[PDB]
Amino acid sequence: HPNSAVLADFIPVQLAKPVPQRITLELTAYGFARAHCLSNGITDEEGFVQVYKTVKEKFDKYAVSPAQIKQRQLVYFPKLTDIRDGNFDIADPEPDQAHLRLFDIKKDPRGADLKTRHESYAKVVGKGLEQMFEGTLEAPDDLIHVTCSGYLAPSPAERMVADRGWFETTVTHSYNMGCYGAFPAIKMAHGMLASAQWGATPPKTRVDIAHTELMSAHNNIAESRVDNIISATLFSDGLIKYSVYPEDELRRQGLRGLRILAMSEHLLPDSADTMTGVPGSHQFVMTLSPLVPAIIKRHVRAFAVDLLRRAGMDFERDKDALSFAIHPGGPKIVDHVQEELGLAEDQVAISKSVFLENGNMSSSTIPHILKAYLEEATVGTRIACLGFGPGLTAAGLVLEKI
Amino acid sequence: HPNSAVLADFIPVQLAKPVPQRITLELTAYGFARAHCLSNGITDEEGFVQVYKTVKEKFDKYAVSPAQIKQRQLVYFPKLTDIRFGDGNFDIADPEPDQAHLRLFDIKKDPRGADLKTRHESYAKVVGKGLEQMFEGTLEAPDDLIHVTCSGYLAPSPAERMVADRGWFETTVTHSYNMGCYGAFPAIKMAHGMLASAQWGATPPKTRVDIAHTELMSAHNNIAESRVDNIISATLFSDGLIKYSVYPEDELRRQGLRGLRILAMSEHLLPDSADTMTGVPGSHQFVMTLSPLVPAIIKRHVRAFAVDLLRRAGMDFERDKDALSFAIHPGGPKIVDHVQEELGLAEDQVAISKSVFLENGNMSSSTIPHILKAYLEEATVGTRIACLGFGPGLTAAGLVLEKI
Numbered sequence: 045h046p047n048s049a050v051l052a053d054f055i056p057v058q059l060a061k062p063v064p065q066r067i068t069l070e071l072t073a074y075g076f077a078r079a080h081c082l083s084n085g086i087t088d089e090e091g092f093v094q095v096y097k098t099v100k101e102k103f104d105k106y107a108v109s110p111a112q113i114k115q116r117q118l119v120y121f122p123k124l125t126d127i128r129d130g131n132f133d134i135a136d137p138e139p140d141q142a143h144l145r146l147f148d149i150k151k152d153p154r155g156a157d158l159k160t161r162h163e164s165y166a167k168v169v170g171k172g173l174e175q176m177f178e179g180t181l182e183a184p185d186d187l188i189h190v191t192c193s194g195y196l197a198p199s200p201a202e203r204m205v206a207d208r209g210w211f212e213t214t215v216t217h218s219y220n221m222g223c224y225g226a227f228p229a230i231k232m233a234h235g236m237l238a239s240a241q242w243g244a245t246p247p248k249t250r251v252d253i254a255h256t257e258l259m260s261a262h263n264n265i266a267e268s269r270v271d272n273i274i275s276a277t278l279f280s281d282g283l284i285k286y287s288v289y290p291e292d293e294l295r296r297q298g299l300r301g302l303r304i305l306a307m308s309e310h311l312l313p314d315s316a317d318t319m320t321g322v323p324g325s326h327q328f329v330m331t332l333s334p335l336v337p338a339i340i341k342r343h344v345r346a347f348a349v350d351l352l353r354r355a356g357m358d359f360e361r362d363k364d365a366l367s368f369a370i371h372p373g374g375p376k377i378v379d380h381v382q383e384e385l386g387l388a389e390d391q392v393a394i395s396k397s398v399f400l401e402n403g404n405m406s407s408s409t410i411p412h413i414l415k416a417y418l419e420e421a422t423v424g425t426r427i428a429c430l431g432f433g434p435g436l437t438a439a440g441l442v443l444e445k446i
Numbered sequence: 447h448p449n450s451a452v453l454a455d456f457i458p459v460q461l462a463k464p465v466p467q468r469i470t471l472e473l474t475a476y477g478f479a480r481a482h483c484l485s486n487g488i489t490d491e492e493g494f495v496q497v498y499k500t501v502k503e504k505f506d507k508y509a510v511s512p513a514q515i516k517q518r519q520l521v522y523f524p525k526l527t528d529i530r531f532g533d534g535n536f537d538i539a540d541p542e543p544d545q546a547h548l549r550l551f552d553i554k555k556d557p558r559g560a561d562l563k564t565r566h567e568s569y570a571k572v573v574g575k576g577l578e579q580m581f582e583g584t585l586e587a588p589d590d591l592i593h594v595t596c597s598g599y600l601a602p603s604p605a606e607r608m609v610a611d612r613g614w615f616e617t618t619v620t621h622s623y624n625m626g627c628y629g630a631f632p633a634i635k636m637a638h639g640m641l642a643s644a645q646w647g648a649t650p651p652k653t654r655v656d657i658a659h660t661e662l663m664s665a666h667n668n669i670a671e672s673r674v675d676n677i678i679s680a681t682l683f684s685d686g687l688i689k690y691s692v693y694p695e696d697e698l699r700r701q702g703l704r705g706l707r708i709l710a711m712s713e714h715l716l717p718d719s720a721d722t723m724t725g726v727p728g729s730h731q732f733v734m735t736l737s738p739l740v741p742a743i744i745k746r747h748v749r750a751f752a753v754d755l756l757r758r759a760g761m762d763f764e765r766d767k768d769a770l771s772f773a774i775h776p777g778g779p780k781i782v783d784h785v786q787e788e789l790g791l792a793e794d795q796v797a798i799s800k801s802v803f804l805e806n807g808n809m810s811s812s813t814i815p816h817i818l819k820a821y822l823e824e825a826t827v828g829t830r831i832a833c834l835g836f837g838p839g840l841t842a843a844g845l846v847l848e849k850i
């Protein structure tokens with residue numbers, strides 16, 4: 045096919061061994077309780093014990109459970125060494141890796157300030173990027189950097205590109221587009237191949253897209269609000285990259301891929317305050333209203349109907365033969381979308397699995413799901429991809445494995 | 447032309463009356479001096495007098511002068527009517543209550559000033575009003591609206607909130623963020639991509655992409671650091687808000703508009719220069735550093751970059767350059783001169799870029815769009831313009847345009 049772009053070669057990197065969810069819940073409850081006491085000047089022991097009991101009860105009530113997420117990669121969760129009489133014993137790290145310690149449960153419960161967290165994000169994402177691109181043999185024409193969890197100029201992506209001596213590669217930042225960030229990056233990539241075909245640049249044969257989300261860098265243990273307990277137990281870290289080729293180049297290379305058939309994205313009414321993020325003195329501060337599932341449920345089916353129509357497909361006739369890659373924004377989101385679209389389990393199985401084994405890795409989640417489809421599905425399989433994030437924004441893509 | 451995109455309809459909005467450079471230098475030196483004393487708990491008068499004398503000397507040596515930049519729009523600098531003076535010190539009157547979020551510095555208590563979240567909340571307010579002014583004449587929603595900034599990152603953004611306020615629920619919004627002073631270039635690049643992606647059929651047909659730049663550099667005032675490159679930054683940058691549209695050429699003709707047709711685009715990093723221009727969000731503002739080496743590094747790479755850029759548009763640098771205008775981002779007081787000299791250009795080929803700088807200062811990513819607006823108004827039809835911008839990376843960005 046001429047005028048066709050194709051996703052391929054998804055490469056994730058794990059930077060830290062995932063932590064079993066029940067351990068994350070025990071230590072996070074403990075930290076929240078310590079922080080609450082520091083923030084409120086509670087220094088007596090019985091007082092701690094009372095607060096700690098209340099805190100555990102709230103986690104038991106609201107936290108994402110180990111039945112919902114089995115484990116999470118949390119680069120900035122304490123090392124199992126060293127987690128140590130009714131408390132936990134968190135060893136100071138060796139000055140040699142102080143940059144992994146951003147929380148403080150002893151002195152200042154606000155923990156590291158935003159500059160310090162950004163310096164750490166650059167060092168951690170820098171190493172993650174070198175690993176993701178270690179098997180890259182030739183520079184891309186473009187490299188797109190997706191993140192909503194650390195904003196530096198120049199970025200760790202620009203520094204990697206310069207480190208590889210790739211002085212003919214355009215670097216574009218695709219930033220602050222939250223959980224759905226893969227969708228604008230693939231649209232920009234499809235746009236770069238199409239701009240080249242129009243002649244505004246010389247020809248191009250590959251765009252790489254690198255996501256580096258360190259949501260654990262934004263831990264906030266000083267705020268006990270329910271939505272913060274939920275976020276602290278829901279989100280996880282994820283680093284993954286993939287390429288977008290013009291289909292003739294994909295073929296010349298003998299590669300299998302997911303051909304882009306259509307894209308869509310826009311805002312949903314009466315929703316802007318329901319999912320927010322603002323940089324503060326210490327971290328990117330997030331809010332996440334419990335109204336969000338209902339608003340997603342309200343608009344998903346119409347959005348999917350239109351998305352299929354843009355692909356030359358018809359929802360009524362074609363949706364039974366489709367897979368649906370659905371971003372698992374919260375524990376029930378895939379189920380809500382599944383119910384509203386009338387989907388069978390086998391249509392949404394990979395999305396549920398990625399969530400269960402990894403938690404919500406922000407924009408890196410849909411790429412992990414697409415990675416699984418590309419590695420498991422038969423050629424000919426068509427996939428409708430749906431994601432939702434701040435705006436609220438609905439984003440969609442229709443793909444066909446080739 | 448088929449497969450052709452075209453810039454048009456540049457609309458700036460001025461939010462605050464520009465302040466003459468000399469009073470900004472005086473008040474800013476005073477703020478730096480008061481902040482050094484506050485930071486250090488120095489309360490002695492003579493002690494303050496001595497620091498202030500030292501600070502003024504550093505500004506006389508290093509600050510961008512009124513000969514280099516006549517005035518700047520600075521939303522976060524007080525209006526001249528609120529300044530009190532007389533004894534060599536300054537005081538600032540209380541702002542009108544609905545304008546209190548305009549006060550993000552503190553020279554009486556805690557010289558770090560407003561924290562980063564408070565600054566983002568003020569930026570949301572100012573930019574929200576700016577956007578409403580910028581899009582007040584818009585008669586039909588665009589297919590896409592690209593928000594450009596490097597001076598305030600919120601989710602959802604003021605641009606997405608505007609789009610929802612207007613009921614524009616078929617408009618895709620894309621954030622084109624953290625690409626610094628050259629940020630019009632990736633934005634124009636994404637707009638072109640969106641029109642070409644539509645032609646490929648991955649979306650329905652599109653007729654207009656709007657790009658809205660909102661740069662409030664003055665929200666990032668940092669009077670607590672007296673290092674030289676911060677004296678330069680505090681006196682060089684300025685605020686700028688401006689929107690423009692990218693049309694497929696057939697639509698632009700249907701509308702009867704003049705525009706700048708896009709012929710070619712290029713962008714890539716310069717070697718060994720990542721640490722020469724940096725920004726990092728901290729507790730109170732985006733902290734910037736700017737190396738004195740930037741001009742030499744740009745100068746040493748700009749010719750090969752321009753030759754390649756012209757080649758991408760079908761042109762030959764040595765044969766064709768005398769006929770082109772060159773829009774050059776004025777990143778610092780000597781940048782256009784340096785580029786001008788390396789490329790062997792005549793004053794008249796770079797005059798608008800120097801005038802924009804002299805009249806406005808460096809409005810970050812908004813500066814190139816103001817230059818292009820002037821070429822669109824003033825240039826003869828058929829004039830071709832090579833546009834060059836620099837920013838962190840370092841990154842060199844190029845665009846070749848033709849007025850139609």
Ligand code: NA
Binds near residue numbers: 215216625713841
């Ligand atoms: Na760039």
Ligand code: NA
Binds near residue numbers: 309437
């Ligand atoms: Na968006």
